[PDB]
Assembly symmetry: D3
Homo-oligomer: 253 residues x 6
């Protein structure tokens, strides 16, 4: 069925999950993206022009795809999380999780009371309009929470955050983290690299898997060796941009 969340389970068994970012915000290219074979695709709702109106068509486009659909909320607040849970998202990427407090809110937003604060609707895409067996009971256990550590504060509290019940994975937002460490546009800086591995280290420390976005293969391969399990190796936008540009160059120079 919809449950159990196989993606959430792969993360638990700390298996390597290869993902790709999506920002093209449309069902046509996203259906093609789902054929690639990635383990998870992040439908970016924060840095990509995506909203409820584009999320649903794309989620339909991904039906029958092995890739686990993950939504990256525009911010960590309960209302949007609620709306995103009902339209059919079972995995979440929460930008800028700086405290254990925030980490809990995020988890609570994906859970029906008393376990959480999720609002209850009786018919929607999540429970496929009432066709999902034992929905209410199951739902609260089949939602993946991926918190992004991309601020100094988030780093300082990485340990508490990773220990939080519900937090299924620790994700590192390199670009934001680099800017946060006074190295905007320079994540490769040894300063950023040390902060990145630290987060990984602590993630592993609390049994939670770590993850990161890294369109550069070398970095991707380095992070995987550092232990990271859910790693995004690129984005539809990026590969499309490079591939097309490259194609033009091999004929025009």
């Amino acid at each position: 069925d919809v449950f159990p969340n196989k993606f959430k389970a792969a993360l638990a068994a700390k298996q390597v999950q290869i993902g790709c970012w999506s920002a093209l915000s449309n069902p046509i290219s996203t259906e093609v993206l789902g054929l690639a074979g990635f383990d998870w695709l992040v439908l970016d709702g924060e840095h990509a022009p995506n909203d409820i109106s584009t999320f649903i068509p794309q989620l339909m486009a991904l039906k029958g795809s092995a890739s686990a659909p993950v939504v990256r909320v525009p911010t960590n607040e309960p209302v949007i999380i609620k709306r995103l849970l009902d339209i059919g998202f079972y995995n979440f990427l929460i930008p800028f999780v700086e405290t254990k407090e925030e980490a809990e809110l995020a988890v609570a937003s994906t859970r029906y009371p008393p376990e959480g604060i999720r609002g209850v609707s009786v018919s929607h895409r999540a429970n496929m309009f009432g066709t999902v067996a034992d929905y209410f009971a199951q739902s609260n256990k089949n939602i993946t929470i991926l918190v992004q550590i991309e601020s100094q504060q988030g780093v300082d509290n990485v340990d508490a955050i990773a220990a939080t019940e519900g937090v299924d994975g620790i994700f590192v937002g390199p670009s934001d983290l680099a800017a946060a460490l006074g190295h905007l546009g320079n994540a490769s800086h040894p300063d950023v690299q040390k902060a990145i591995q630290h987060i990984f280290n602590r993630a592993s420390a609390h049994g939670k898997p770590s993850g990161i976005l890294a369109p550069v293969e070398a970095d991707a391969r380095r992070y995987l060796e550092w232990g990271a399990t859910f790693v995004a190796v690129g984005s539809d936008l990026g590969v499309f941009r490079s591939a097309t540009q490259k194609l033009a160059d091999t004929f025009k120079k």
Copy 2:
């Protein structure tokens, strides 16, 4: 014209208002829905994939319909209420109203200062681009506020909330209330039923009409006898789901 708000008046005279929920989020089916004859249709902006972009087409679809269009905001905050008032909504359903404070904010968001905090625009669907006579003066008296009591806190303060100036009706969100009372997916529980009637009782106590959503006819008929006036007897989604499924079954078993 647009004023006076006849729906707001029916509620005041505590007449029985039979409504239906809408979640299909589109102008085509919603135009058909408007032919049914319901007294009010709730265009759900909280648990249904609806937004400004879908609300307007549907509001146009409902033009010439007896049904009073009611928008169920995604949450109780001034900005979205403001935007929803300008596109042409004169009746509001406010989710999770737990305190008299919140109840006031909600009312204040639908009123131009000093009476409230509503932002002023000079041409929009609300004043039909300047063709509504004495708009500014009238507007502040023709907006229906329906607060949802669906939390324990909301219950505890039902009395204060119902006494609030502006609050035109007390609505009970069964599912959320049930989850709030430790009975997720079991609103029929005598515990929930007692909390429901209590809210009704208090609504009546302060001269304000009470309301509820109940797709099951028996419950609907029971709540009406308990006194509830604005009752939603179903949703486009639900009747569509049952009707279609049923149709398939009478031929395939």
Copy 3:
């Protein structure tokens, strides 16, 4: 997988196929429709505001559904059929098939040279962008063609039409045949019924299953009793319309 076309197979085996019409023209309701369990759903591109931009979302909404998607082209002409083939439709309903040549044209429009005149593209939804095995070869033998006999001339040539290689099923258009016989709005007329019966015998006469649209149950059972195998027992529009009117009535009457 895409191939073989099970719907095409079932028809050939003359087993009863229970379908529903679709005019709501939107992914949200059609996804809910796909849950009903019909053996086939007709995305009407002739009398409903559907087109390529509404078809893809609805086709995606039906992914996973047991229902076989069937598109009713606005008219029998190569170009639109060409385009509809590539967006993912494997089953077609052709309106106003009046002669053997037109029937031929329809079949040809769905097959690659030299079997037919279908245009060639290498990547589209039909072959799921190069993932469907032996696409070219298999596609030509996996397209269901359902012709509509809904006119005087269509009846006169019913035998020639039914004997055409590629015509997988003879469909009767009650409203249009009735009008063709000077009985607009009265399909139940003896003259009309007689023709429907005739088309069915001539269809069975050539070992081709017969079909028709019967929104009224008593008629659906009558036609099935006569031996029609693929019968549409209603439409999402008519069901939604009727069910919402009924719900309103039981409480406002």
Copy 4:
């Protein structure tokens, strides 16, 4: 109500009908347009990016407006007319009507058998999903057909075209007639004016009102002075374009 068609009646009575063209192709501005007070608005499907997906929202936007909606089909052919009839258009403008047969074809395209070849559907916007009384019967006598004489051949056959049963008004296409006479961009040319005058007399000659599009006031008054009854005095596009240019100029010049 839908029937009788008041616009159709007014024309027959040769009373002046003042209209405006629409090319903006969107519900928002067209709703504002519907407030102006024109007796008729032309939703151009020939030279504006309009189509069935933009028509329904705009048709809904015009509900309540005193303006009679008129659709300008992209071309004179049965199928598109069939589809446009069902989405809610009761008035049509046919481009390039050059012969009596074509004029005939147009009328026939809007009438059910045996009067015409219009396809039959039982539920759509035209009959407001089964709510319009005696729809079939009344529809055939309530469709306004406005033919455009904008070509040499159209002028030669103006009398035959005007005498056709069903042709409710003769419309002149200034830009196209001008081009047909070798005067592209110069409709004010004596040769062109002469033909416009001629078409008007031949129209009046058969008791059929005449019409034309005159964005320039002096021309509008001239044509009205000549006796044209349904005159389009401009377009939303031209007005918006001109008014915004003027506003910019008065402050930046």
Copy 5:
């Protein structure tokens, strides 16, 4: 390139910037609007049905237009500002800026740390998917911040707000300010007029240019003489409304 922000520079040199408001929320009319010649066009995201989904098409429509695109956020909060910066907005109008605090938040939301709190994305419309030279460094200096003073509190602190680093212009929202001063719908009241000039006075006092919206020419000309530099002389909606209505009247009276 994209940088340097010429509009931001014109404001600095306190040149007269003639702008127009946009609320029609669509690419078709907005492309025409861009031909008018205004120095800046405010794509209203607060009182007009605009969102990310409509903003992008319109921004593309404005490409190659002299007009500087300005977005009027729905409210002053970092998340939406972030999303609006990535889709391609370089100039912002911030509604209801009442304190120096708020003024700073607004500026900080448009700046990458440490200078601000802007979230970092590597490929988007702002840096044209990586083709803008020295983006990160440049961006933080090429973003225009226009704060709206339209409350009593905002007035009381006009001085502190105008002195804030980042604030590029002081804009007066007449309608809201009037309502704020107990004169809803009467901005011409000497009370409002005195508050307006005060704001202007203080804007100039801190070297920052002042601005205002005034569809009435007299007021527009008066404010310009009072010193205001960035003045919106109308809106697409308003000129469209007046122009169309006027056109109908010159022919029907």
Copy 6:
């Protein structure tokens, strides 16, 4: 400016034009595509889900791009060409041009009387709503017509087709020509290659540049080696598909 048509000029000068196909049907990715640097991009309206509603946004997305936008009409017929001309397309690709008459029809469809049969409108994207100088005059001599020889009959008449006044370039459709020769899926077949070579010589024979679609590099170089000037070296779809599959593979294999 719009005129002269530089792409039309380059072709006439037989200089190499490097293009890419577009089927993604959306403004977001097409804007990124426009950055690649191709001399021309084909917005496919024949084998991709593109149409007037997707074309305008994409056309706007290409404003500023050095790439010349080319539209591939669904089929060679006056009406669709008429409409596509007005929305802003100056370059056309005509599928299945089999005879000299059809080639003629295509050219005529793009020119105003008496040169052709193009319909006349005074304000649209083509003349940028009356801003393009001497539009009527210049437009007729600035429309690029690229005909596709992709059928047996098209090859037989290649010389007559190439000698037609207005035919700016002979394009070969590999997939369709191959099917026409009984080599579906095998364009590399000697029989097919022979015809492609032939069409190229007959094209060069009449001083008309030749073109073709070659997604595989080795073929692109081969055809360019043979002297083809306008060659499409791929499609956004194929590139995106291939690049995303590759990225997934390098980490999951």
